[PDB]
Amino acid sequence: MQYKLILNGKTLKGETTTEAVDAATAEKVFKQYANDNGVXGEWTYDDATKTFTVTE
């Protein structure tokens, strides 16, 4: 359903959400968006809060 992405990058701080019924799909969306926004970073999965966190 609603997945969260937390972007904690040295030049990019922010958060966004996506409608995905699969964690891999949500990861794909977040990974694409992050990568296109110049973020590689350390990826952690906070599954309890349905959140992918990028620490750059």
Give a written overview of the molecule:
The protein has one helix spanning 23-36, and strands at residues 2-8, 13-19, 42-46, 51-55. The chain has 56 residues and is α+β, with helices and mostly antiparallel strands. It has a four-stranded mixed sheet with strand order 2-1-4-3, with helices on one face. It is globular, with a radius of gyration of 10 Å. The PDB classes it as immune system. The entry lists the keywords immunoglobulin binding domain, immune system.
Give the SSE layout.
Layout: E1 2-8, E2 13-19, H1 23-36, E3 42-46, E4 51-55
Protein name: Immunoglobulin G-binding protein G
Subcellular location: Secreted, Cell wall
Sequence repeats: 3-56
